[PDB]
Amino acid sequence: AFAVDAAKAYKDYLASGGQPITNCVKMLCTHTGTGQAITVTPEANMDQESFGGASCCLYCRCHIDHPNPKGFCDLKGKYVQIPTTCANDPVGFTLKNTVCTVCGMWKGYGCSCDQ
């Protein structure tokens, strides 16, 4: 019945003015990529930075179990594209945001499936 809520702890710590997790691994890339959120190689466009996935995953970085019941991580082994305006906190961004199942862009940061 009891489980640490890692997401909630970090979201609250952020709001209390805590320093975002650092040492997310930022990649060198052309910045001419598709812009999709989670890719097998870096896909940043001119508005995004590309990072190594694992270093941007709250569960990977905190040495705790993943929410997926079989323990699968969405980010490890891939690259997450982060809007340049949020690249100060890649971990928070990926926690607080959602990927569109249709076009693979961040809902609200690339997804335009409502037009």
Place this chain on the structure above:
Amino acid sequence: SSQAWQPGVAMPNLYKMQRMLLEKCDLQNYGDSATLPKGIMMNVAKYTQLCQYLNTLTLAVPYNMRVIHFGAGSDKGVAPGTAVLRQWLPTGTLLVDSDLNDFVSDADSTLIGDCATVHTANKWDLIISDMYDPKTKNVTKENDSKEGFFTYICGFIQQKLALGGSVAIKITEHSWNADLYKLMGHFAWWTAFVTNVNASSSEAFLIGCNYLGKPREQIDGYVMHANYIFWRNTNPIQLSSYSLFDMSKFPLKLRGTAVMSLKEGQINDMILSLLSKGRLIIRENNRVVISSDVLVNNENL
């Protein structure tokens, strides 16, 4: 003169041919720091230039390529070099990394422990090591050939590197090993490559290109490290990060290099020619299986 627009500088051949004695390394820019693009870690820049250089060699790049990366952790708890390797290597390439200390990684599998605990059933097409022992900083003595993890690496290459495969092994002035230089003579070509972002350091990657499983050339590793230090002592390299800004051609070309499971008798001069050219890999193509030996102890007296 055009050097600063390269990812780095490789040991010129005339220095390989010398018979210097070992001196102290004294670099004129020792300790200077490159200006890295915004928010880019040193080791992303260093591994990026290493891979940019490997792109100019005749690496074998088979389907279902197997790469292993030693010394992949960091005082950050993450693995920036692994991230660059996974960016560079064809998608789906199997990548295993390892380190003495725990870290989070994008490799397909990570083993924590001294590298001499690591075993693998299968052979590899590319071995990368950035292992460095921090006690090497305590220079109390002549700069002698070092054993430790280098002894493992030499064995690992002879036992588990596919013919036709390649290596890049980090050394410095004091973290080096004479058998590793000797083994370079067992590859079709070899060099010592200094990245431009770290040109102020005596670090280099000893690169062996296309393994032959026997000596093409007899190399005295003591003399050869003396030659390398002589080169670095007389050729100041200007810190540069220029090449980090062009990633258009960075990915390793998937050449589809053939893989055959031949036996030692079948390696004729023509096979050896294909190996030498990066056109063939020789190893089993079975499934990749790794493990780490764990010492068991019960401390309750």
